[PDB]
Amino acid sequence: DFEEKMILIRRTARMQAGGRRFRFGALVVVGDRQGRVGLGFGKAPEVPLAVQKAGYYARRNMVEVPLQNGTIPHEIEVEFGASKIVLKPAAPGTGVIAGAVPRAILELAGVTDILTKELGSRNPINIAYATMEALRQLRTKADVERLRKGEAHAQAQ
Amino acid sequence: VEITVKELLEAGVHFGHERKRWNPKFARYIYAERNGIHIIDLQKTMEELERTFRFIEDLAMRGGTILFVGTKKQAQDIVRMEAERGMPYVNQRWLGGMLTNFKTISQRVHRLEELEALFASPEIEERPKKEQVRLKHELERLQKYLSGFRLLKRLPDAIFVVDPTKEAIAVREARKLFIPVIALADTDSDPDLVDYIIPGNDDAIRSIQLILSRAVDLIIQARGG
Amino acid sequence: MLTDPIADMLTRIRNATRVYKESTDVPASRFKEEILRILAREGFIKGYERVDVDGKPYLRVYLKYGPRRQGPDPRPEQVIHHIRRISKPGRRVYVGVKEIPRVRRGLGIAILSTSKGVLTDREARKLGVGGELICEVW
Amino acid sequence: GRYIGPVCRLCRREGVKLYLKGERCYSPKCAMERRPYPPGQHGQKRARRPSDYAVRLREKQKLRRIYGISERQFRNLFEEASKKKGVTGSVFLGLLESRLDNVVYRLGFAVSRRQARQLVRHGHITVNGRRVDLPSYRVRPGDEIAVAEKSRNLELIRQNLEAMKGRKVGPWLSLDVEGMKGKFLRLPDREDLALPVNEQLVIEFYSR
RNA sequence: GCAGCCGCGGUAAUACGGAGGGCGCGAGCGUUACCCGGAUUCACUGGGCGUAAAGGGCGUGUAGGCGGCCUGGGGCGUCCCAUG
RNA sequence: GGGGAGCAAACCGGAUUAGAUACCCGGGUAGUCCACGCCCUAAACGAUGCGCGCUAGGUCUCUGGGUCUCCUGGGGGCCGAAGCUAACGCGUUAAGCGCGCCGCCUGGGGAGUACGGCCGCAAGGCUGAAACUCAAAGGAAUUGACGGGGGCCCGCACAAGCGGUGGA
Ligand SMILES: [Mg+2]
Ligand SMILES: [Mg+2]
Ligand SMILES: [Mg+2]
Ligand SMILES: [Mg+2]
Ligand SMILES: [Mg+2]
Ligand SMILES: [Mg+2]
Ligand SMILES: [Mg+2]
Ligand SMILES: [Mg+2]
Ligand SMILES: [Mg+2]
Ligand SMILES: [Mg+2]
Ligand SMILES: [Mg+2]
Ligand SMILES: [Mg+2]
Ligand SMILES: [Mg+2]
Ligand SMILES: [Mg+2]
Ligand SMILES: [Mg+2]
Ligand SMILES: [Mg+2]
Ligand SMILES: [Mg+2]
Ligand SMILES: [Mg+2]
Ligand SMILES: [Mg+2]
Ligand SMILES: [Mg+2]
Ligand SMILES: [Mg+2]
Ligand SMILES: [Mg+2]
Ligand SMILES: [Mg+2]
Ligand SMILES: [Mg+2]
Ligand SMILES: [Mg+2]
Ligand SMILES: [Mg+2]
Ligand SMILES: [Mg+2]
Ligand SMILES: [Mg+2]
Ligand SMILES: [Mg+2]
Ligand SMILES: [Mg+2]
Ligand SMILES: [Mg+2]
Ligand SMILES: [Mg+2]
Ligand SMILES: [Mg+2]
Ligand SMILES: [Mg+2]
Ligand SMILES: [Mg+2]
Ligand SMILES: [Mg+2]
Ligand SMILES: [Mg+2]
Ligand SMILES: [Mg+2]
Ligand SMILES: [Mg+2]
Ligand SMILES: [Mg+2]
Ligand SMILES: [Mg+2]
Ligand SMILES: [Mg+2]
Ligand SMILES: [Mg+2]
Ligand SMILES: [Mg+2]
Ligand SMILES: [Mg+2]
Ligand SMILES: [Mg+2]
Ligand SMILES: [Mg+2]
Ligand SMILES: [Mg+2]
Ligand SMILES: [Mg+2]
Ligand SMILES: [Mg+2]
Ligand SMILES: [Mg+2]
Ligand SMILES: [Mg+2]
Ligand SMILES: [Zn+2]
């Protein structure tokens, strides 16, 4: 029970003697606007069917974004193939200043203020993935402190 | 019922594979190599068999089902009989999907439950004698492949596999579904993929025979009798 | 030939960790051992110990990792996710105090060489001094 | 100039009620009450999904149209609001709300925002004892916003203050009904204004 | 005839032309020209070179660039304070 | 300047072919060979600059040393961890992780052209544009189609027959 978004829809061709033969691809985001978002890419031979598919997939591929007051805990830059996303967190009332794709993903995550640039290939699908991977990677003076102290944590805390 | 370092030697549990096939990751479980073959540190095997059996036990004590897996010709009849005495097992072929595509596989279960239904029935003597045989054949194959899977009414709480590098399909599936993997692992294997390991000969009857029984022994110990 | 031995140190640690080595040795140096001393405090490594390889001074760096993970790849989170040399020979990088940077919104380290010691960004900004910007970590 | 032209219609393009009109915007006549679809030949036909631009655009327009105001005056305030220490999303509305044309309407002297601009421009308004007739004049806190001693007798002036019999005025304001004066106390915090706007979308529309 | 670009128009044109209707701004709105942006497309920040454009045909070696471990002096670079 | 067996640009003659003016055949000069002096280009290719450190292993091979089951150096190959890559692939012979230094690239055609300069006996080489024009030029991979590509299979498809059409 999340909101869904359409990143993008495309049509694609095979070949058989006597014609092209088509298939559809849907890129779908799914969020609960409070720190959980999932991305799904589904292909079927019919467009709405593909989206259904896509939506199913999205919910299985879910990522808990640690939102820190409308924004993300530190800056971060992530490459995926040719494509590369940068996420710089921002102050209140800044807005999601991000491209076409990352926005949709960020918005449904529950993010409200954040800085962004795409870089390298701009391909939707990889930018989609680079963003989801970027968010999959964020940590906290908390998340981090446990990793480093860790090996005797709870002596100082 | 525990196990002696001695009994393990007699099994020939420590006899690894040749040096040719070999996973360097596995080195942490090796004493040395004599005449080409790595010899598994039993002093280790034993201390892992403990951590591992301790898991198997509480899991059983809490009602968990353990799926046993062995495709290898050596294992088969050992996996089978050992499982039965009370879990499910796979010993013919690991059908890709059995875990991650569990639904459409177990679909095939209701098919044979329903063909079993049809052969105890009058309604069978109806169909033309050609579909009749061709339906007994459908049933027959299903029993072959599924006679142990058909006990799983939901995904296992853990799977116990004999030879992870042979089975790393089964293994991959388990890890993707966050089901704990337990394996009898030789030197050819990535031990990192095995949540609960037992390093020792994955090859000889006398080896598997020992391990699997003591496992199962432990299971019905901690199932009340 | 060898030209940056601090690069070499960092990179030794980087490559080590990616293979989950428990530890790696690095040819010793008053300086390097200072940088290690820092990395120790901040919890990126369990610590270093001074050892001797063939009667050659070395520094055994003992690496630290995340906990095992479930899912189909269980190789622990890194603790030193990213280590990187900033001032290099053939382009040195000096920073005034009001130009010492922040690494990962405070979550990371910048190691600085100053006339008052080898300091972390925070340590240095507290003593009110700057210097050579060696590396960044997180 | 400012926008004159048919209004219950933007009421309809924005698909929500803007209260651009006045006494009937409240009655069973706003055509939102009768034809909630947008104007034109095609407003009957099912919509296409909006582009991000579309939604960013329209949310801007909805907000702007509510307040009267040219885009050049509008953008110039959003600009000023970004140069402010504050949360510009909010700072903006506070700035908007600071307009005399608006202060007057919120005060309840004018039936509507449009009617308010005239009341200002035709000189019917006192600010701190003096006359003001720029609808754009910015009211600061501590300002007293009165009706001219002259224009005290208008039908609508009196007819509107008699609706104040049973309304109560915004929390950042104080009305002196009998004395025909109102005072501007502080800037409205975001929570006071209850517009149907997602201010953040406006901000986003401008960072393109 | 349109056309910034991809393209549109060969008898059903949401792309030409007119009309109705709509959108955007409003004493202004468009066009052309020029600068910066977008263009991490000269990449200091911030790019590359097996096959996409890109390793000199190979060596020798000049200027230059760069350079191991410990201790101490100098304090040029570098860093801090005060002041102009 | 010497040398010339065999071969063989051009050239001579035979064939082929719609025409050969090439591919096939018979000849044959330069040249191919030696010395000396020039030329200085190449798919001069690993299409991968040099040096150094770091990052699983397996196997084949050339070549050193040892307490030579095996251990330990230096080469040459194949397969592969981690990683890298647009992919193909690379993967301790890196195209991985890093530092130093050099050379080079910046859309296709125009064009390795023009102009200028340098070298050269010459042929020519090195260095190297723009106007203009296009909206692509490109790399790898996917499905298909096709091949005077390969593999296996089938149809009265050929073959083996019997009887006809084409003539009246
Ligand atoms: Mg988290
Ligand atoms: Mg890249
Ligand atoms: Mg902040
Ligand atoms: Mg690009
Ligand atoms: Mg583009
Ligand atoms: Mg095996
Ligand atoms: Mg300075
Ligand atoms: Mg801008
Ligand atoms: Mg036109
Ligand atoms: Mg048009
Ligand atoms: Mg038209
Ligand atoms: Mg009209
Ligand atoms: Mg009009
Ligand atoms: Mg630029
Ligand atoms: Mg650079
Ligand atoms: Mg480039
Ligand atoms: Mg080429
Ligand atoms: Mg090339
Ligand atoms: Mg070369
Ligand atoms: Mg070249
Ligand atoms: Mg020199
Ligand atoms: Mg020097
Ligand atoms: Mg030095
Ligand atoms: Mg010194
Ligand atoms: Mg000194
Ligand atoms: Mg001094
Ligand atoms: Mg000095
Ligand atoms: Mg200085
Ligand atoms: Mg001669
Ligand atoms: Mg001839
Ligand atoms: Mg001839
Ligand atoms: Mg001849
Ligand atoms: Mg040596
Ligand atoms: Mg050897
Ligand atoms: Mg070798
Ligand atoms: Mg290979
Ligand atoms: Mg790999
Ligand atoms: Mg090497
Ligand atoms: Mg490269
Ligand atoms: Mg150029
Ligand atoms: Mg050009
Ligand atoms: Mg050239
Ligand atoms: Mg040439
Ligand atoms: Mg050339
Ligand atoms: Mg010339
Ligand atoms: Mg000459
Ligand atoms: Mg040359
Ligand atoms: Mg190709
Ligand atoms: Mg064929
Ligand atoms: Mg025939
Ligand atoms: Mg015949
Ligand atoms: Mg006839
Ligand atoms: Zn209305």
Side-chain angles (χ1 to χ4, degrees), chain B residues 86-98:
Chain B
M87 300 292 126
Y89 56 96
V90 177
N91 74 27
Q92 280 302 316
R93 184 163 108 68
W94 180 268
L95 302 177
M98 287 189 156

Side-chain angles (χ1 to χ4, degrees), chain B residues 69-81:
Chain B
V69 170
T71 285
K72 306 166 35 151
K73 305 148 194 176
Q74 296 84 298
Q76 283 197 339
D77 312 305
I78 289 85
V79 161
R80 182 72 175 260
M81 268 167 274

